[PDB]
Scaffold this active site. Structure first.
Site, PDB file in Angstrom:
ATOM      1  N   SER A   1       0.819  -1.206   0.000  1.00  0.00           N
ATOM      2  CA  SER A   1       0.000   0.000   0.000  1.00  0.00           C
ATOM      3  C   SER A   1       0.855   1.259   0.000  1.00  0.00           C
ATOM      4  O   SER A   1       2.041   1.223   0.333  1.00  0.00           O
ATOM      5  CB  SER A   1      -0.942   0.013   1.206  1.00  0.00           C
ATOM      6  OG  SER A   1      -1.962  -0.961   1.069  1.00  0.00           O
TER       7      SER A   1
ATOM      8  N   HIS B   1      -2.476  -8.944   4.809  1.00  0.00           N
ATOM      9  CA  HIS B   1      -2.358  -9.768   3.611  1.00  0.00           C
ATOM     10  C   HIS B   1      -1.960 -11.211   3.911  1.00  0.00           C
ATOM     11  O   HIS B   1      -1.417 -11.904   3.052  1.00  0.00           O
ATOM     12  CB  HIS B   1      -1.359  -9.131   2.647  1.00  0.00           C
ATOM     13  CG  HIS B   1      -1.689  -7.712   2.298  1.00  0.00           C
ATOM     14  ND1 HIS B   1      -1.245  -6.640   3.041  1.00  0.00           N
ATOM     15  CD2 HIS B   1      -2.436  -7.191   1.296  1.00  0.00           C
ATOM     16  CE1 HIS B   1      -1.696  -5.519   2.507  1.00  0.00           C
ATOM     17  NE2 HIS B   1      -2.421  -5.826   1.447  1.00  0.00           N
TER      18      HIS B   1
ATOM     19  N   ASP C   1       8.399   2.765  10.316  1.00  0.00           N
ATOM     20  CA  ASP C   1       8.164   2.371   8.932  1.00  0.00           C
ATOM     21  C   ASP C   1       7.067   3.243   8.325  1.00  0.00           C
ATOM     22  O   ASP C   1       7.344   4.120   7.505  1.00  0.00           O
ATOM     23  CB  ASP C   1       7.795   0.887   8.855  1.00  0.00           C
ATOM     24  CG  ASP C   1       7.604   0.395   7.429  1.00  0.00           C
ATOM     25  OD1 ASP C   1       7.082  -0.728   7.260  1.00  0.00           O
ATOM     26  OD2 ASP C   1       7.977   1.121   6.482  1.00  0.00           O
TER      27      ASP C   1
ATOM     28  N   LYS D   1      16.502  -6.559   6.555  1.00  0.00           N
ATOM     29  CA  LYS D   1      15.470  -7.574   6.402  1.00  0.00           C
ATOM     30  C   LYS D   1      15.038  -7.627   4.940  1.00  0.00           C
ATOM     31  O   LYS D   1      14.621  -6.625   4.357  1.00  0.00           O
ATOM     32  CB  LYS D   1      14.274  -7.317   7.334  1.00  0.00           C
ATOM     33  CG  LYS D   1      13.450  -6.073   7.051  1.00  0.00           C
ATOM     34  CD  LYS D   1      12.109  -6.150   7.763  1.00  0.00           C
ATOM     35  CE  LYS D   1      11.138  -5.115   7.228  1.00  0.00           C
ATOM     36  NZ  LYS D   1       9.766  -5.318   7.762  1.00  0.00           N
TER      37      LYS D   1
END
Ligand SMILES: O=C1[C@@H](P(=O)(O)O)CCCN1O
Ligand SMILES: O=C1[C@@H](P(=O)(O)O)CCCN1O
Ligand SMILES: [Mg+2]
Ligand SMILES: [Mg+2]
Lengths: 436, 434
Positions: free
Chosen positions: B40, B158, B318, B394
């Site tokens: 998104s 998700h 984030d 990551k």
């Protein structure tokens, strides 16, 4: 001198297991290749060399293979002084060096890793793109973009469901180009994801090793219904057809076949080869199935031959032929199938894989270049399928980039080939009729 | 020149959606880069330009961005005459040509694609490996290998299950090297697959977008138990710790938080930020959790600062900072977090990404280079995390090669470094001390 350095290392494949990577250095730069790995260990396949140390990667390490390359194979090839373009001469040298039949000393993965890297280096020496170099090694001149076969529904030995048959694929034979085929495959795939989510719940759209879905299904006919439904709902009813990898050696039980071999063993539910064939007949009748791979066991030669002689679709040998020229020669003799599934690491070298391809094509067979369930970011088989003018490849769903890498490379190749580029389309079995 | 040609095209990412790939030609050869894509977009992120043409890829095509590169950006950068080693000049030229706030004219995916290919071309022009070129652009002389953070259990918006929190990661801090770190991660991952198969069934070992498992569990503490069970059964209890991406914005309701938002809307099971914070406190206690990403909503600044000032673990922004310098300094002033997640496509260029990193590092933050849920076979961020010396990255599970390609490349880099190769280890938060 052509070869300055050959260095091998241990990388991880798409499953997180170690595999062989080989860097080859010439004056024109670095050439890198990695080796794919199957899920099961075929008895007719060339030997995949594993360390067997249970405390390191659960025994799946390839340090011994890497060492064979770095300590034995590398200095030998550099000593020969053979050019990187002498693919056959260099491949042969490794085979005598290995001495064994199934390549058990160095390992097929060690020998292939070097073989693939040499082919890439030799291509730059010829100043040709990789697919063109492969083409000349095979004796071809009129290239072909293949029809992609995306596996979208997964069953068989390594799926969580009860679905006995391994792979259900879609083939955009009615696409305008390869890039167009990628669009059709992707759109149907996302349409299918929605159909599965609505019919099986949101927790049923996670993917398997090759990016396909594995919803809880038992009936193989039901899997075909999902695929056809997705195709129609995406609006491509007769631009896309269906292919199948049955992998029947996985449920071969005492001369019969178990279409529920992931259930408690009840020998009564087994069916004969003739029964399994009649089931296929019904599928071809009710669904746009145009190709079936491994419809019977790898040693059930009578069933293969009997079925092939009575159906008009494509019959693909995988575990039957294991990319082995000897097994292929026998299959030609008995007319067991009409298509060779080409897995380069099954035989262990580029030269031998090309020979297996020519052996099939000269006898009227189709070929289909194939990935392994364990793949890498390597895109060699993309150039391979084009160079061999095969017309068909299966290298995964349009998901996970160990699959997309091959598909993306093919889109770049189609772009590069421009107006010379010809899409196989409905002639994926016999692309030679288009070559003009 | 020094760029002879820039040709962009449309490829597919790991989810089968179109993305931008860019070919840049110099006299020293071809340089290729591809652009990742998140699930998104936010309000502060740089704009990702899609076609919206439902005749193609259900409107997910990027032909507009490709055309902007091939027709506008490419002839302009070539006309500039600038050398490829001039990362900042070429990036700024694209910034002013776009001339918008969030790169909404050409698209961020358009600008970044060229920017990444330029950087690769620049590395070869100065005859350096990419991570060394980035090191010189960042102003670093040291080079350390990062601690990888593999997600293994997935939840969030998700994932198919009922698990609220998005990611559960393992970090091999106690490994001898990065190559050893990969081995520890892969062995625990494979161990975990067997653990899940036994407890939840054969059908539960299928993977999500980034390669992690999504078993049908509800409790977030249950996800932590599975991970710990896997770490210990693999025999790496002392060497492997746990990280988390909560993505709390996804279940932010009425100023509260909903740890069961994927179940029909019930305002009864809502909890506050203070209530949520306490849950984290208990997580950190009973489990080796050393890092948490997005513990609260992207605009719940009170909850962030209050929680950060009362823990010792790493707090990663984030959704909060979206690699946006403006949002980063606000996060600094309010002391909202102590670590910046670095997503190059969120800001849109190599230069701005390096700057956002240095801005964080100068204020005493850690930086974690990160993948997107939609990735490609491109491995730029592998060289990026080394050149920026952040100590932590990551980029997925040890599964699916859009993840492995970065991990493989990092292993190649460690090998190429040899003696000068240093593993961040237990100092992944501040590798500066090494
Ligand atoms: O039969 C198969 C399996 P494996 O790679 O495990 O042989 C899946 C991949 C392709 N194929 O034809
Ligand atoms: O929050 C996320 C998501 P996306 O890239 O979809 O935002 C998954 C990938 C990394 N990350 O930190
Ligand atoms: Mg097969
Ligand atoms: Mg996140």
């Amino acid at each position: 001198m052509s070869i300055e350095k050959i260095w091998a290392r241990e990388i991880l494949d798409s499953r997180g297991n170690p595999t062989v990577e080989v860097d080859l250095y010439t004056a024109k730069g670095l050439f890198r290749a990695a080796v794919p790995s199957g899920a099961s260990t075929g008895i007719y396949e060339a030997l995949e060399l594993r360390d067997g140390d249970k405390q390191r990667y659960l025994g799946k390490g390839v340090l011994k293979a890497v060492d064979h390359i770095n300590s034995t194979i590398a200095p030998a090839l550099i000593s020969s002084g053979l050019s990187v373009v002498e693919q056959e001469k260099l491949d042969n040298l490794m085979l005598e060096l290995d001495g064994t039949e199934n390549k058990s000393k160095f390992g097929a993965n060690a020998i292939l890793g070097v073989s693939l890297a040499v082919c890439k280096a030799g291509a730059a020496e010829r100043e040709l793109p990789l697919y063109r170099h492969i083409a000349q090694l095979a004796g071809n001149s009129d290239l072909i973009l293949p029809v992609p076969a995306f596996n979208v529904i997964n069953g068989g030995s390594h799926a969580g469901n009860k679905l006995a048959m391994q792979e259900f694929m879609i083939l955009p034979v009615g696409a305008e180009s390869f890039r167009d085929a990628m669009r059709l495959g992707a759109e149907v795939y996302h349409t299918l994801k929605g159909v599965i989510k609505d019919k099986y719940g949101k927790d049923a759209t996670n993917v398997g090793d090759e990016g396909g879905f594995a919803p809880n299904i038992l009936e193989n006919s039901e899997a075909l219904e999902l695929v056809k439904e997705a195709i129609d709902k995406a609006g491509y009813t007769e631009k896309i057809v269906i292919g199948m990898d049955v992998a029947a050696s996985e449920f071969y039980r005492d001369g019969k076949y178990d279409l529920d071999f992931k259930s408690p063993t009840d020998p009564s539910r087994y069916i004969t080869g003739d029964q399994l064939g009649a089931l296929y007949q019904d599928f071809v009748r009710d669904y746009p199935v145009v190709s079936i791979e491994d419809p019977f066991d790898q040693d059930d030669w009578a069933a293969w031959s009997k079925f092939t002689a009575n159906v008009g679709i494509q019959i693909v040998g995988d575990d039957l032929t294991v990319t082995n020229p000897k097994r292929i020669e026998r299959a030609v003799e008995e007319k067991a199938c009409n298509c060779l599934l080409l897995k380069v690491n099954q035989i262990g070298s580029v030269t031998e894989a090309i020979q297996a391809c020519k052996l099939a094509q000269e006898n009227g067979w189709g070929v289909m270049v194939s990935h392994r369930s364990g793949e890498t970011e390597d895109t060699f088989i993309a150039d391979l399928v084009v160079g061999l003018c095969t017309g068909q490849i299966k290298t995964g769903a349009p998901c996970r980039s160990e699959r997309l890498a091959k598909y993306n490379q093919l889109m770049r190749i189609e772009e590069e080939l421009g107006d010379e580029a010809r899409f196989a389309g409905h002639n994926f079995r016999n692309p030679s009729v288009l070559h003009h």
